[PDB]
Each structure stands twice: as C-alpha cells, then as structure tokens.
Amino acid sequence: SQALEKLLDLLDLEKIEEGIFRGQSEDLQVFGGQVVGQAIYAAKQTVPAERTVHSFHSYFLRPGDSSKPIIYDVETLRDGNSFSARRVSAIQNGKPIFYMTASFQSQEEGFEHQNTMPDVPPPEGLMSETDIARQFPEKVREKFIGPQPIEMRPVKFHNPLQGSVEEPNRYVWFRANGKMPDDLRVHQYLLGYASDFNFLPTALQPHGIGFLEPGMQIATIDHSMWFHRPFRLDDWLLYAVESTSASGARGFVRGQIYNREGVLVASTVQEGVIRLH
Amino acid sequence: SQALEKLLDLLDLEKIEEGIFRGQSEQVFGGQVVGQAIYAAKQTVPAERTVHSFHSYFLRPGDSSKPIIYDVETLRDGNSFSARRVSAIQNGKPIFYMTASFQSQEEGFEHQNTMPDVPPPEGLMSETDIARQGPQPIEMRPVKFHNPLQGSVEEPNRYVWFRANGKMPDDLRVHQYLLGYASDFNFLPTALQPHGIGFLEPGMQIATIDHSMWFHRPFRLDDWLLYAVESTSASGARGFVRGQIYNREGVLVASTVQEGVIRLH
Ligand SMILES: CC(C)(COP(=O)(O)OP(=O)(O)OC[C@H]1O[C@@H](n2cnc3c(N)ncnc32)[C@H](O)[C@@H]1OP(=O)(O)O)[C@@H](O)C(=O)NCCC(=O)NCCS
Ligand code: NA
Numbered sequence: 155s156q157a158l159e160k161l162l163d164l165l166d167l168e169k170i171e172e173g174i175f176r177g178q179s180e181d182l183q184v185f186g187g188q189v190v191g192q193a194i195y196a197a198k199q200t201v202p203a204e205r206t207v208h209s210f211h212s213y214f215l216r217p218g219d220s221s222k223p224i225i226y227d228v229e230t231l232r233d234g235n236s237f238s239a240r241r242v243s244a245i246q247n248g249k250p251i252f253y254m255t256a257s258f259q260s261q262e263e264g265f266e267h268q269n270t271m272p273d274v275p276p277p278e279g280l281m282s283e284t285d286i287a288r289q290f291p292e293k294v295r296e297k298f299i300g301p302q303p304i305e306m307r308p309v310k311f312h313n314p315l316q317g318s319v320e321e322p323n324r325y326v327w328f329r330a331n332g333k334m335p336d337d338l339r340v341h342q343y344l345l346g347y348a349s350d351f352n353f354l355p356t357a358l359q360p361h362g363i364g365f366l367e368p369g370m371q372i373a374t375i376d377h378s379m380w381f382h383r384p385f386r387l388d389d390w391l392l393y394a395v396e397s398t399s400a401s402g403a404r405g406f407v408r409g410q411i412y413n414r415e416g417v418l419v420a421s422t423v424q425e426g427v428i429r430l431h
Numbered sequence: 432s433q434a435l436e437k438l439l440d441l442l443d444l445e446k447i448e449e450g451i452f453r454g455q456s457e458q459v460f461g462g463q464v465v466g467q468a469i470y471a472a473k474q475t476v477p478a479e480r481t482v483h484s485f486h487s488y489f490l491r492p493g494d495s496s497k498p499i500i501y502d503v504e505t506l507r508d509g510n511s512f513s514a515r516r517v518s519a520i521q522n523g524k525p526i527f528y529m530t531a532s533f534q535s536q537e538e539g540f541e542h543q544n545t546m547p548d549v550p551p552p553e554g555l556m557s558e559t560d561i562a563r564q565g566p567q568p569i570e571m572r573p574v575k576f577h578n579p580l581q582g583s584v585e586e587p588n589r590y591v592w593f594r595a596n597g598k599m600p601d602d603l604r605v606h607q608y609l610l611g612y613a614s615d616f617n618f619l620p621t622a623l624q625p626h627g628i629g630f631l632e633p634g635m636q637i638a639t640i641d642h643s644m645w646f647h648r649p650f651r652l653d654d655w656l657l658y659a660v661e662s663t664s665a666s667g668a669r670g671f672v673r674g675q676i677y678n679r680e681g682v683l684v685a686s687t688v689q690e691g692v693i694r695l696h
Contacts, residue, residue, distance in 0.1 A: 170510060209690055211488075262667060262668050263668075264665070265665045266665060267664065269587075357540075378688070383463075383666055402534065402538075403534075421663065
C-alpha cells in the first residue's frame with residue numbers, strides 16, 4: 155500500500171494555473187505509464203466534471219528526465235454538446251517530450267456489445283512477477299524486486315534477460331496493491347499507467363529476445379487507448395496482448411483489458427522501435 | 432480511369448506556403464480529409480521518411496461545398512523518425528487534427544498474424560455489380576453486402592476486397608494517401624451489425640470521433656486488398672472498430688482503429 159499511495163500521490167498533479175500542471179517523477183528516464191497517467195490527470199482537470207475520458211492518442215518524442223519535474227500544458231480544443239477534446243503537452247527543459255490528445259464524453263446509455271474474454275487460468279493459481287523475479291540478475295533497473303504499486307500475475311513468465319521463441323501473445327492479471335478511492339477518474343489515471351506494462355515486449359516473443367538483453371533498443375513511439383466501460387483496479391483485471399506485426403525495426407501491439415467477470419474494459423494500441431544493436 | 436483520376440488529383444494539394452496546403456472537397460467524407468492530411472504532412476518531411484503511423488480526431492463536420500486548409504506543424508526530426516501535426520481548417524475553425532510519424536525504411540524483426548479465411552475476390556461481385564442485380568474510384572467486392580437502410584442482426588465482422596479502379600503510379604506515397612482515404616470505407620458501420628440497424632436508417636446518428644492507422648508494410652492499391660473489420664465493442668453511445676488490411680497473398684499491410692458516435696434518435 156505504500157508503493158500504491160506514492161504512485162497515486164504522483165498522479166495527483168500540482169496546479170500552476172488553468173490547464174498548467176506540474177508533476178514529479180518516480181525517479182527510478184521516466185516510465186511511459188507515468189507520463190500517460192499524469193497527462194490524463196491534467197486533461198481531466200480542464201473538462202466538465204461529468205465528462206470522463208473515453209479515448210486518447212499519444213506520441214512519445216523524447217525520454218523524460220526522472221530527476222526533474224514535468225510540466226503539462228493543456229490546450230482546450232473543443233467543447234461540444236457531448237464531447238470535450240484536449241491536447242496535453244508534457245514539457246521538460248523547454249522541449250516537449252510527449253503529446254497526448256484526449257476526448258471526454260458525457261455519460262449516456264446506448265448500444266451495447268463486446269467480444270469475449272480469452273480463456274485463461276485464474277489469478278489465484280499464479281505467482282506474482284515480483285516472486286518470480288527473485289530468481290534473477292540484476293542490471294539495477296530493479297522495478298522487479300521491490301514492492302510494486304500494481305501486482306502483476308502472468309499466465310506465462312517472460313524472462314527479460316532471456317527470450318524463448320514463443321507465440322506473440324501475452325496474458326497478465328493485475329491489480330492495485332491496496333484499496334483505491336471510490337472515484338472512477340483515479341482508477342482511469344492508474345489504468346493508463348498500468349496499460350504501458352507487459353505491452354510492447356510482446357512483439358519480441360517470436361524472435362526470442364528478452365527486452366532487457368544487452369544491445370536491444372526498445373522504445374515506445376505511440377500509445378493510444380479507449381475506455382469502453384467503468385471498472386475498478388482494486389479487483390483483478392486481465393490484459394490480453396498480442397503483437398499482430400513487426401517490421402521495419404518497429405513492433406506493434408494491441409491489447410484488451412477485461413474484468414474478472416469478463417467485461418471488456420479498455421483497448422490499447424502501441425507501436426515501438428525494436429532494434430537489436 | 433476517370434473517377435480514380437479525379438480522386439488522385441484531389442489528393443494532390445495546392446501549396447499555399449511551406450506547411451500550408453489547400454484541398455478541394457469532392458458533408459465531407461472522412462477519408463478525404465484523412466488522405467489529404469497525409470499529403471500535407473509528407474510534403475514537410477525528409478524525402479526518404481515515409482509514414483508509418485498517424486492518429487486523428489474529428490472535431491466538426493466538414494462542409495463539402497468549400498475547400499479545406501491544412502496547416503502543418505513540425506514537431507520533431509529525430510535520428511530516424513519525423514513527426515508532424517496537421518490541422519484541417521474550415522470557416523476559421525479546426526474540423527480535424529492529425530499527428531503523423533514518418534520513418535526511414537529499415538530492416539528489422541518480421542512477423543505477422545494470419546489473414547482471415549474468406550472467399551477470394553475473383554468470384555465476387557463488385558458493389559456496382561450488385562447495384563443493378565456512376566463509376567467509383569475504388570472497386571469494392573464485399574464478402575457480404577449490407578443494406579444501409581435495412582439492418583439485421585449480424586456478427587460484428589465485415590470483410591471487403593478493394594482495388595483502385597485504374598492503373599496507379601509507381602509512387603508508394605500516392606498508394607499510401609489512397610489507402611488512407613480507403614480506410615474510412617466499410618468501417619464504423621460494422622459496429623451497428625449486432626443491432627440490426629443500417630447506418631443510413633432514419634434517426635441513426637453515426638459520426639467518426641477518431642481514426643488511427645499503422646502502415647506496417649509497402650503495398651500496391653492497384654491489386655486486390657482485403658479489409659478485415661471487427662467491432663470489438665459498443666457502449667455509452669459509441670461504437671468501436673478495429674481493422675486490418677492484407678494484400679492478396681496474405682501480407683499484413685496496415686492496421687486501423689476508429690471510435691464513432693452511434694445514436695438512435
Ligand atoms: C522518439 C524516438 C523514436 C526517438 O527516435 P530517434 O531520435 O529517431 O531515434 P532512433 O530510433 O534513430 O534512435 C537511435 C539512437 O537515438 C539516440 N537517442 C535517444 N534519444 C535521443 C534524442 N532525444 N535525440 C536524439 N537522439 C536520441 C539513441 O542513443 C540511439 O543511438 P543509435 O543511433 O546508436 O541507435 C524514441 O527513441 C524515443 O526517444 N521515444 C521517447 C522515449 C519515451 O518513451 N519517453 C517516455 C517519457 S515521455
Ligand atoms: Na491552455
């Protein structure tokens with residue numbers, strides 16, 4: 155719960171003025187997920203309280219410096235009858251490191267359908283990523299050993315230091331380490347953050363290269379997400395990820411996030427650079 | 432051919448300044464704006480870098496009677512990647528924003544999923560064929576033809592073969608603008624299929640919110656391409672679709688994603 159509380163406090167941004175916020179970093183380059191979560195927070199502050207995020211698109215232009223604050227500038231694009239759109243610019247040292255555009259909608263009942271949650275083993279029968287990691291050794295990028303803000307339980311373990319040729323699919327159960335506030339928006343920031351884990355490295359699976367192995371350049375180029383339905387992150391959710399394609403030194407992943415009842419919560423898409431040097 | 436020739440010209444934009452372009456319209460079709468925006472951005476990019484991705488939002492309906500201005504901001508020029516943001520302007524307002532990324536063609540890891548098992552395009556009737564039982568710039572051979580005024584409960588999947596009605600230039604950039612244009616056809620309406628409602632039914636409000644695409648691989652639009660569309664979701668008066676585009680040999684060439692308004696008045 156301390157890990158979780160630290161993260162939540164980090165995604166609760168400092169207000170500088172209307173649509174100008176300042177966020178601190180985890181410190182331990184900055185994690186894509188932190189920027190995403192903070193960007194969502196920033197944009198949501200500028201939108202009517204009722205209109206909650208339903209989608210965003212982002213490009214990652216530069217690494218963030220984890221030792222320095224990030225400013226989030228929020229541009230008002232349009233407030234229509236239903237939709238409010240915003241562009242978040244994340245700025246450090248006078249340069250943009252990341253842009254997000256996001257769209258918020260007034261709740262309303264409408265047409266309802268969804269695909270099916272893939273058939274996988276429940277989380278009660280799986281080890282956590284931090285338990286499996288102990289065995290491995292390490293670089294000193296050790297977000298694998300400490301207590302984590304989010305518990306990850308993979309259906310199949312993928313050693314970041316040693317790949318094995320595998321199908322380009324990954325399934326991971328996950329959940330906030332602590333009880334969350336009763337406030338959908340905070341669950342949304344956290345989910346955006348969480349959605350950048352166990353994602354892009356899926357594209358390496360057929361090639362049998364672990365994402366931390368020496369000389370492997372892996373970096374996110376873009377990250378987009380769609381919040382289909384409400385959810386809570388203090389109960390188990392499943393991230394189903396496939397990499398439908400790699401080419402041109404790039405790797406492409408799509409994800410779908412389901413609650414334990416099988417409800418389709420969110421969908422994600424990301425392309426990154428995947429280059430063995 | 433004729434209709435194809437006028438589309439291609441209408442995607443070759445009038446240059447007003449560096450990063451400012453004017454495009455004629457054919458309300459506007461989403462694909463036109465998309466395809467035009469891609470031209471705009473590509474003009475401001477180093478020669479060798481071709482588009483590998485873009486994201487867009489639709490803010491306002493585009494008036495088809497008037498032209499559209501495409502303003503382009505230069506966002507970054509990196510070691511390999513260049514990024515630009517296009518604003519499409521009409522009546523002094525933004526109707527649409529796209530950010531797009533361009534990269535050098537480079538050799539890397541290769542894999543792809545597998546093209547759906549569908550009837551080949553050679554046996555299939557074109558949509559103009561079906562119409563009797565004017566010329567379109569792109570020939571469409573649907574696996575299953577839908578009636579925009581009559582829906583019936585169908586699975587949230589749709590498969591359409593398509594091709595450029597005419598011989599195209601040996602210029603990947605043009606094939607890309609055109610694929611951009613094409614990607615907005617036989618897409619968002621797939622979301623209505625589980626609901627037995629055609630998109631052109633009375634009281635059906637259907638409008639693109641966002642449209643994003645990834646150009647995984649080179650291709651030609653003057654040979655047959657399959658658009659494989661699913662709607663994995665619909666909720667809160669929106670509908671969500673994902674698309675994948677394969678060439679006739681099963682090569683995955685592009686992916687797409689759009690969310691849209693779908694509301695019954
Ligand atoms: C945007 C991105 C694709 C950069 O692309 P690029 O500058 O064209 O980089 P390339 O793919 O050619 O990178 C290769 C080189 O760039 C260098 N590089 C890294 N950051 C750089 C920067 N800001 N400017 C210039 N070069 C950079 C690397 O050291 C690497 O060395 P190499 O040429 O020997 O391989 C990507 O690498 C990136 O930086 N993404 C953002 C990072 C991120 O996730 N940030 C999270 C916080 S927002
Ligand atoms: Na602002």
